[PDB]
Nucleic acid binder design. Sequence first.
DNA 1: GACCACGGCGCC
DNA 2: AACGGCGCCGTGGTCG
DNA 3: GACCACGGCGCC
DNA 4: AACGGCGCCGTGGTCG
Lengths: 538, 537
Amino acid sequence: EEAPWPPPEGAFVGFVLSRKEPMWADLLALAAARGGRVHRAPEPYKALRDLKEARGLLAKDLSVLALREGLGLPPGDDPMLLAYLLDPSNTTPEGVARRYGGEWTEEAGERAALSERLFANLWGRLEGEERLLWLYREVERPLSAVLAHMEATGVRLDVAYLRALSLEVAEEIARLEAEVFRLAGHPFNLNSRDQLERVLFDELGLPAIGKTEKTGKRSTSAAALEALREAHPIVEKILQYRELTKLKSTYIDPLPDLIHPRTGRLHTRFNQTATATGRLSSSDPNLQSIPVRTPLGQRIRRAFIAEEGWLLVALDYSQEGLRVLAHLSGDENLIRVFQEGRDIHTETASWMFGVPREAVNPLMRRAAKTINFGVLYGMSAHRLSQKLAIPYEEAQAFIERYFQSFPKVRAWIEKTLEEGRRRGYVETLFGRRRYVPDLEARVKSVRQAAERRAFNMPVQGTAADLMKLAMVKLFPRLEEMGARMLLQVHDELVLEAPKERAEAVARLAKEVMEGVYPLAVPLEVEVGIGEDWLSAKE
Amino acid sequence: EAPWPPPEGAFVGFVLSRKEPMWADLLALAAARGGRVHRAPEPYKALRDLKEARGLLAKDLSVLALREGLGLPPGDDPMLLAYLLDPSNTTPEGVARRYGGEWTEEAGERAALSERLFANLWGRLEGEERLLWLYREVERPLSAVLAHMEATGVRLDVAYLRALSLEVAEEIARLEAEVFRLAGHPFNLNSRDQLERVLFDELGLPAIGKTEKTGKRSTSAAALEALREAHPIVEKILQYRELTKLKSTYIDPLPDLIHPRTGRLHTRFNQTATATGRLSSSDPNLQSIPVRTPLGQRIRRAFIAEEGWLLVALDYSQEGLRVLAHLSGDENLIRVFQEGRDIHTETASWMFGVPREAVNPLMRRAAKTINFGVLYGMSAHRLSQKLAIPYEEAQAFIERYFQSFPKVRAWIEKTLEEGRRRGYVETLFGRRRYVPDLEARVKSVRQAAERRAFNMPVQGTAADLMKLAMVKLFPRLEEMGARMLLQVHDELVLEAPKERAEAVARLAKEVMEGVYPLAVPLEVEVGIGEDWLSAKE
DNA sequence: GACCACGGCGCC
DNA sequence: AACGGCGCCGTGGTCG
DNA sequence: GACCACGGCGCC
DNA sequence: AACGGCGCCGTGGTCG
Ligand SMILES: CO[C@@H]1[C@H](O)[C@@H](COP(=O)(O)OP(=O)(O)OP(=O)(O)O)O[C@H]1n1cnc2c(=O)[nH]c(N)nc21
Ligand SMILES: CO[C@@H]1[C@H](O)[C@@H](COP(=O)(O)OP(=O)(O)OP(=O)(O)O)O[C@H]1n1cnc2c(=O)[nH]c(N)nc21
Ligand SMILES: [Mg+2]
Ligand SMILES: [Mg+2]
Ligand SMILES: [Mg+2]
Ligand SMILES: [Mg+2]
Ligand SMILES: [Mg+2]
Ligand SMILES: [Mg+2]
C-alpha cells in the first residue's frame, strides 16, 4: 500500500481543494499513485515542485492553482477527457467513477488511485477508436494546457467605469419602476413573472400569446410581449427594466468584485467536459455570456480592457456554423454564398426590418441569426410566423423555399438522421460522437426533438473541433511572441499582446485560424485590435 | 521599362547558366509589377532588394540565394498552381504553351510571364477550394522547406567511397574474367543484345520473358532469376550488373559532386515532377541510394553527419497500407496495425520459408513486390513466375487477398466508378489526377488506366501527409538548431547536434504521427546514427 | 559524329 | 505486353 | 428557514 | 409544448 513522498515518475495525482474555483481555492491535500501504491505529500503546496506534470482527474484545475502560485506544472493525461470522448454525457468524476469503476471520494490518495485505474480502464474501452484517440492526443490533452494558461492569466477590467455604470443603471431602474407602478395602478414585484402575469393579462387584460414550458401559465417572455411593445408603453418599460436589472445583477455589480488579489484580474473557468456537442463552457463567472448586443450591452464590453502597454486582439470566425454546414453537406449554393462574399445574416435582416445592409444594427443581425439558424435547425412554422409576424402558410412556404434553395442541406440532414437511426449516435468531421436516443420514438414530437439534437451536433461539434485545433496550434506561437490567450467564445478568440507586437499577433492568429483544415469552403476570420473588447470588434 | 529596384509584391524572373541552382551562375534578374519590367544591372546584388522570390521556379532562385549567404524565401509560384490544377503541368515551357504566354530565355520576359500566369492560373482555380488550401497550406510553404534542404546538402565519407571504388573495380575484373572463361570468348557484359545471343543462342538457355517494345528475349533479373542456381554464369552476370551499376551511378560520381562552398553533396527536390503528388529528386537522385543488398548497405554508410552531429532517420511504417486502410475503411486491414503485425514480414516468411527474425532486407523488398503487386493489379501469369507456383494457384492467391480484404475491393470499384464519371481521381485532400482511357475499348489499355487511377489516391494521400509533416516540422527544427536533409517519400533524414539528437527525434516522431485523424494510427520508425545505415538499424 | 529510344535497374 | 510512381546508366541503330 | 424547479434571459 | 448548445438570476411552493 503506502510509501513516502515523492512518488516515482509517471505517477497519477489526486488532490482536494477548499472549493470549485482553482484560482480562489486552497489546496488542502495532494497525493500520487503508481502501480497501486499511494504516496501522500505532507506539505501539499511544496510537493507540487516534485511533479513534472499533473496527470489525473481534473488535471487542469490543479495546474491552474499551480500557475497562481508561480509554478509551471502543465496538465497531462486526464481520464475525464477519455471519458468525455467515449461519451460526452460523461461530465463529472463522480459520474465517470460510478459508470465505469471505483468511487470519487474526498480524499487525495483515493482520488490518485482512482485516476490511475480509470485511466487504463477508459483507455482500454477506447481501443479501436482511433479517431477518438487522435482527438485525445492531438486536441483535448494539449488543449487542457492551453486552458490552464487562459484561466490563470485572466482579463483586466475597468473597475471605475463599471462602478459609474452601476450608479447610472440604478437610477434608470428606479425611474422605470415608478413609471410602471404609475401605469398599473399599484406597486408590485416587476421581477416576479407570476405577478407580471396577473397584472398584464388579468388587470390590464392584454392578449396572452404564449404558454410557459412546464407550468402551463401565460408567458411574460420577450417572445410573448414583442408584438405588444409599440401599442402599450407599460410593456416597453418592463422589458427595459428586465434588461437593466439582468445586466446589473449578473455583470455590472458582481464582476468588478471578482478582481483577484494575486493578479489584479478577473478569472473564469473553461470547462472542458461540460457539453453534449464538444464545445467548451465557461463558468464562475461565465465570460462566454458577456452582453454585446444592446446599447447597454456594448458599454459592458467597454469594461474589458488590456494591461497598460497592451492591446486586445479579437478574432471571430465569420458565419462559422454555416461554412461548416456547407462543407458537411457539399451544398454548392451554400458554398457559393461565401465565394461571392455574401452574408445571409445581413440579407435576412435587411428583408426583416426593411432597411439597407449598412443600416443593419447588431440587434437586427442577432434577430436574423435566430431566423436563419431557426429554420435550418427545425423551428416550426407556428413559431416562425410569430417571429416574422406573417401568416402560418407563408411561414410554411418560407421553410420550404430555404430547403429548395439548399437541396443538399436537406439531403445531408436525411443522411445524418438515417445513419444516426442505425448507429444510435452522430459524429463530427473528426469523429467526435454524441449518442442520441429517441430517433425512432413513437411519439412524433419526442422523435422530432431527438432529430433536431442529432443533426445539429455534427455542425456545432465540427466547429468546436476546428476552434480547438486552432487554439492548440496557435497557443505555443503566441508565447514565443510575448502574447497571451485570454478568452474563447466558441467561434471567437480574444488575445492580449504588447501594443508593439499586436499587428503581427493579429496576422499570425488569422493565418493559423483560417488554415486549420482543407474544407470545401474557405474559413474567414474577422480581426480587430483595440484597448477594450468593444473597440477590438469595431 | 522602369529602373531597379521594383515596387513591393513584384514577380521575379531570372536566368541561370544551368539547371542545378547550387552549381549555377546567375546571368540575369528582373522583376515585374502592373506590366512594368524592372531589369537589375547587377543580378547577385539585386537579390538583396527583394523580400522574397515570387514567380516561376521561385525555389531555384531561393536556393542560389542561400548558397550566396542570403535568406530570400520563395513565395508564390504559378508552377505550383498549375501542378495542382493538373499534375501533367511539370515545366514552365509547357504551362506557358498550355495556358498563355511564352517561356523565353530573357529574365524580364520571364518576370512578366510569372505575373500573368499567376493571375491566369489563380483565376482558373477559382472555386477549387481544396486545391487552393493545398497551395496555401502545403505547397507554397513547402517550397521554402525544400529550398533549405537543397542548399544545406549532406556530408559524404569521401575516403570510404574511394576505397570502395577500388574494391569493387577488382571484383568487376574478376567476374568479367570468370564470365569470359565460362562463355568461351570475350564480349560486352553491359550489352543486353550480346548477352541475349550468348545466353540463349550459344549456351541455349531457356528464354522466359520478352522485352517491352523491341520484342527480344529479355536478360532482366526477372527472366534470369530461376536460372541462377543451376548455371554459375547467370549468377556471375547478375553480380557484375550490380557492381557496375553501383560503381557508375553512385560510388564514383557522388564523391566528385562535393561542393566548394559547403563541402557537401547537394540534390534537387523537384516539386512539380510526378503524376501523384510525390516529390522527385535529381542531379543526383538522393531518393535512389542503394540500401537493399550487402554492397548497397555499404554505400549508405558513406552518408554521414557533420562532426559533432548525428543523423535522425524517420520512415513511416507500412505507410501506403495504412493509407489504404483509412481510404477503404477495411477493418481487417485496420486490425493488422492494431495488432502490431507486419504483412511484409508475414509474406517474406512464407515466401522464403524462414522465421520472422531471419527475414533479410532483400527478402522484405521481395515481399513488398508481392504485397503491393497483387493489390495494384499484377497478373496471375507474372505472380506465378515471381512466386514459382502454377497459374491457377496464383489466381487463387489474388482472390484470397481480396476475400480477406473485401472493403479494399469495394474501394477500388468505387474509385474507378467515380473516376469513370469525372475523368479524374483524387487524394484525401483533393489533389487530383486526370486519367483518360478508363472506358477504353481495348481491355489491356483500360485495365492499365485503372491501375494508374486507383493507385494514385493512395500514393498521393501518403505524399500529401508527408508534405504536411514537413511544413509543420521544419520551423520547429530551426528553433532547435537542427536541419532537414532528405525526404525519400515516406522517410525524412534530419541532422542535429549530438546533444539535441534525442529531443529532435522525439519531436519529429510526434509531428509525423499526429498529422491527420486517420482511422489507422501512423507509426514512425526512428533511428539515430553517425551515418545513414546505422541510423536505421 | 551526334542523338536518343531503349533495356535494365537503383529507390519508394 | 503490363502492380504503381520516379531518375540514371551504357548500348547501338539511324541519320544528315 | 433551506432547498431547488422554474421562467426568464445573457452569449454562441 | 418544442431551432440547437450553455450558465446565472430572482421567485415562491413545498417540506420537515
Ligand atoms: C451552429 O452555428 C451557429 C453559428 O454560426 C455559431 C457562431 O455564432 P455567431 O458567431 O453569433 O454566428 P455567426 O458566426 O454565424 O455570425 P457572425 O460571427 O456574426 O458572422 O453559433 C451557432 N449559433 C449561434 N446562435 C445560434 C442560434 O440561435 N441557434 C443555433 N441553432 N445555433 C446558433
Ligand atoms: C503505395 O505504397 C507503397 C509503400 O507503402 C510506400 C513506401 O515504401 P516503403 O517504405 O518501401 O514500404 P513500406 O513503408 O510499406 O514498408 P517499410 O517502411 O519497410 O515498413 O511506397 C509504395 N511502394 C514501395 N514499393 C512499391 C512497389 O513495389 N509497388 C507499389 N505499387 N508501391 C510501392
Ligand atoms: Mg461568428
Ligand atoms: Mg461569434
Ligand atoms: Mg516505409
Ligand atoms: Mg520507406
Ligand atoms: Mg525508360
Ligand atoms: Mg432552465
